[PDB]
Symmetry: D3
């Protein structure tokens, strides 16, 4: 990449300046999942980008999922699943496995990758110092809300204690599990939890890494793809969208309505997508603002 003239290398760096100003000293919550989590070069680029933010004096917070890895581990352990609708029931046994995979495996790899750049990453869950709690969630199947075991939503968040972590120069890598009011640990959808953390921390931005170019309003019409949309318009289009886009959009809606200036659906398939979305106007993502 050095057959590229050095005066255009200058221009791309200098063009980052207004976004460096906007984010210096600010929290950015990054939902990390999908292919940016399974391909090794995307993974290493994601970790380097978190170190980038940290070495600009920005405060990244990383929230991660791990759906497929849990399924794989349960199959290896021969744990037979129960399914209501399209949902696995989270028995105490499935939770133990989920937590052990999310916190003891998926979070650990990301911590080590990030820490290749310095002593930055620290892994946590709602359980650690009671950072946050969960409330049991029901899901709606075939019209009826119903119980699927120990799954929840983020209840309340120790905002102060988390902000201390990032001001110390740490990158929290959050595994979405947390105790309920009775001390019973639930598993939390990582997309929703990221929106809840973003709003509780007064984040400047929420980034949602997904495996798509961005939100299409009439998928698969190629020119239905938007680069920016407001909460009011996004709320109306949501019952139109594909199954897997629902949680990423609901999280954005909730976050931006909760006061987070903007939320972003960006393409995790692009190397250094974080860098592209934050420090460049050539972003493929779609930006959600209030309106």
């Amino acid at each position: 990449i050095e057959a590229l003239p050095t005066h255009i290398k200058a221009q791309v760096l200098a063009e980052a300046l207004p976004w460096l100003k906007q984010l210096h000293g600010k929290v950015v919550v990054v939902k990390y999942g999908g292919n940016a989590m399974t391909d090794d070069t995307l993974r290493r680029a994601f970790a380097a980008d978190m170190a980038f933010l940290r070495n600009c004096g920005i405060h990244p917070v990383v929230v991660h999922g791990g759906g497929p890895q849990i399924t794989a581990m349960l199959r290896r352990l021969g744990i037979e699943g129960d399914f209501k609708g399209g949902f696995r029931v989270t028995t105490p046994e499935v939770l133990d496995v989920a937590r052990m995979v999310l916190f003891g495996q998926v979070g650990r790899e990301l911590v080590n990758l990030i820490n290749a750049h310095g002593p930055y990453a620290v892994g946590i869950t709602g359980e650690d110092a009671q950072l946050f709690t969960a409330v049991r969630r029901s899901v709606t199947v075939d019209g009826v809300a119903t119980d699927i075991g120990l799954v929840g939503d983020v209840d309340q968040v120790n905002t102060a204690a988390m902000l201390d972590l990032v001001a110390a120069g740490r990158i929290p890598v959050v595994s979405t599990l947390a105790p309920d009011a009775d001390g019973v640990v639930h598993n939390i959808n990582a997309d929703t939890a990221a929106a809840a953390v973003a709003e509780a921390l007064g984040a400047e931005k929420l980034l949602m890494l997904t495996d798509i170019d961005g939100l299409y309003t009439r998928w698969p019409d190629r020119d239905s793809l938007v680069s920016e949309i407001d909460t009011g318009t996004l709320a109306q289009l949501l019952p139109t969208l594909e199954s897997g886009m629902v949680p990423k959009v609901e999280a954005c809606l909730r976050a931006v309505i909760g006061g987070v200036p903007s939320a972003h659906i960006i393409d995790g398939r692009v190397t250094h997508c974080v860098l592209v979305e934050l420090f460049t106007d050539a972003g493929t993502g779609t930006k959600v603002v209030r309106g």
Copy 2:
């Protein structure tokens, strides 16, 4: 326990005062393992004791093992073991399982138990913010030192960052895994790691919970049991001792020689053994001091 006269209840509390003075504001590293970790009433008493220390303004640090749980998980996963001497070889696969069980299961339960008393516990490993590193260890089998994979000793310790944690009112619950100088995570014997943490943190005391009354010099002679011994005398008796007492004694030796005022082999089978050993002179344990 109230058929007991209230003026003797006074005397037992008042008799704790000199040990409260000696430990106020001081670090105490507690190696936690054995039966105090599998029986639920001993477990709940261990957690309540950590909260006790914390609510006296003492700084407990908890180091935990989990040998049998790892074995059980490997069998469930059908992972065939390789054995040199009496040692399982820690392949990258066994390490992934070990870390996932130690940090994602065993540490999590203790964090939640402790946190039933308040937002105190926080789980970590050498990986988090590069708190400590490992160096690969060899073991000696049938006379010859030899490789058994990704097992190590604690190399160096970010003393400052850990002391910050405890001064914030947190109880670190340490799972003994850490990266080597190249970022490759090793598993560390929990007994040795506790001694290394104790010495690096300038701990006032190291407590080693084991399943025995204390050190017997001529096991099983009932009256060979000691209540106190010095490093010089303990060093000489060590090649005499039982297989499983070796690591607990080596850790004490190393810790006390490293400047930790005293190390204690106490009986994990006793409810609230920590409270008994620290705040009472009726301790069953054996105290190791330098000499």
Copy 3:
């Protein structure tokens, strides 16, 4: 006290934990007087208990009286008293003697006793750094309110400066004298002053050491003795009570109504009564809460 099984010694210590949690980092104001002040073993136990609180990270504040010692000194000096009702008139001369005995004798002994356990105690009065002021009080004799010289009530309190003292790890030992708005030092009833300090400091508890088992509602009916009562019910019973119980009850009323969660009338004749009342449910005292 070691013919007592060590597993019951554990249980009494472990039973203190919820009261350690409730009082960690909290102010406790202790009115100290009566026999707990004249018998040497009770005195030494009172001082050791203050060191106990301090070495649990609790913030004890000690308020003391000294009625009889003042009388004795005035007789030694041949100072003839004037009496209205049952009250000595506090001339400037009597105040000089009172202050010199309270601050220069009674407070000093307690400071030295406490300091046998460490550099904790510090003696003060309203005069020092203008910590608190007094307003002249009148008393009612035979129906008529009337002047008895330089006696007062605590007027206002430098809450901030006192809290600094205890956060520095100090135990203030307060002699109840303070200047009025014109700089004229008055003597203050120690019971009332303790209630005023408790309320001004946001104390968690006020303990009143007196020479009785507790409040009897129909003295001397043995089974009129209560262990808990509310302000509304206590207010109604007050004109029924014995002469010397009035100030201890009024102080409790005022304190608990002022927002102090509970006030306690405990028996100063019991060694380590403080320890018994705070860290044990076998307390002989009576607890006052709002209602």
Copy 4:
């Protein structure tokens, strides 16, 4: 004092500037005794001068004696004295009286006077928070050193804790009593104690208020009076001097040799002598420097 031209009032103020520079943020220990302590207008001027120092951001520390007041109180109490040489033996009884008069009477008046200008003064002794200790002293009578009871010299000083007091904006008013290594409180000559405090605190100046114009080398030759002298020359002249000048000179010697830049023997009979000696070159005192 306003028949004085306003442009000469300017000049006297402006002439204080170099001494304000030299003492800003510095400790000045002031031994206060003699007539500056018994005449009310001198007393009020002494207190106003301490407030002056404090309101220039200077850190005054006041050490006081009280010999005659102790004698008067002992006579009032009919306490028969024992005398070796010219020294009263300090029995435990005499100490109780001494402490009660120094701390409970003499110190209190000065605290209240100073506090007429603000919440500045705070009274203390070696006993409070173990600020300093004493070691038993013997005196030499008719050639032989001998015991005179509970009299001592300042042993060691909690330099840090005292400096905290003055940085908080407080004026410590010290009564010279302190515990020995066994907790037994001794009385300390106020002149010597002031020198010891000055040296322990790194004071910039020690001022010794005495009832004389200054040191005369050949008393009563009017022109033997000096305004400045060095430790070497002062040490040689000391066995020549009057009985009561010995302690004031020994204190200066010890202080200046201990590293205190200068010590000053100034006339307590002059209103606002402190102000004259510190902020004016027309001082009557004598300055001691090292040489």
Copy 5:
């Protein structure tokens, strides 16, 4: 000045005490101009007085003008002026000259004079760290408001950042220039700017050095001179006053109405006028208070 008795030197110093108390830790804004700025002995006395305030723990802030020096420099550079009414039009060229003379010459001399007493003075303008902004002002000539170029009023003030400067022990020496909302630097009348800084900083006093004894209500009637007046009465007399007294009075009005306890018109022709006005009741100035 030493043919003056030393006991009257005491009295003048001691008479400063209540003004030291009133100003300790307080901001005093000093408009410095006129003859106190051109005569070298008045200048050196002004600088020594700023050091005096600083070495009493007072926080002086110095605002300075420099009208005549700008005129002289423009003539030296042959810059032809344009005049509307009696006002020079401030072209970009005149501003460059003004700023370069005010900040690069007049402010520098005062900084160096003050710094002869220590590392205190620091020169600044609205431009530095955006300490304050300007808004373009129009003037009224022959009845009509009209533009005279890049002249303004102080718009808003970074109160926090300035208070940090003085708490660090610095003396800001302010040259009255500042950017408007678009970054265009304007020149500001120093009298008005001093009033604006005084009000923004919560100053205790504003002193206005001018070349007159004080405000005369019927100049030149010798006994129309006042020593104190309120804002309501001063506002009514203002359209009566001389041309050059208008800005000094308007600044006082605005400041005292803005909450500054008092503003003072004092005679810059008097050596150490600052010292006389602040620490003496023989001040020639006139004090403005609200009413």
Copy 6:
């Protein structure tokens, strides 16, 4: 610059990461002069680059010259010069002009440019709070060292006070003038002063903006141009070099020998040269390291 593929824009940003890590929290002293100071687009790019560093949590310090502007002002004022060798003699008059142009004109423009991006820049000289001093320098003409008036070298530097400035988030813009030990302000060569500031502040890098591609060892041989060289080799080549390269090389030598890890001669004619040199390996400059 958006006809450039967005995945190469990513790569240039991501390639800055190791230099962000190396400079986060570090001082970088930037000598700013030449054409990067007279062309408006280079100037605006220089200011934006200083804001860039600041919004990465880097601590830029800007040192500036202004030779030609001083000459122009002296000619406008008709100040006749005296010349020894090729040096103007700096009379007190020339110094007044120099300081007024450097601090009151050249520094002010840069402060305002930088401040277009935020409240960052602050202008200073050695005079402000005595930040640094000068010692009079002589120059050597035709073999003989000789006096050229009030020109000097940086003597000593208040390292602490400057580091406070940058930690507050400020960009100091230094005009190289400072008082000597007697308070007499001298003018200092900006190249040398930048090296002295770099060494006194423990700077990570010194950048020297000059109008050349870099150091040529055999100018004008096109392929004598180096990209890196050590102090030992650079010292030997220095008497070979062009007149104007001498000060830029001497400054580098002194700085790197003084412990500054590297000094850089970079081309001020390139837009955003700072960004290119720090965050890119395509730098045209030459790096000086010790050897």
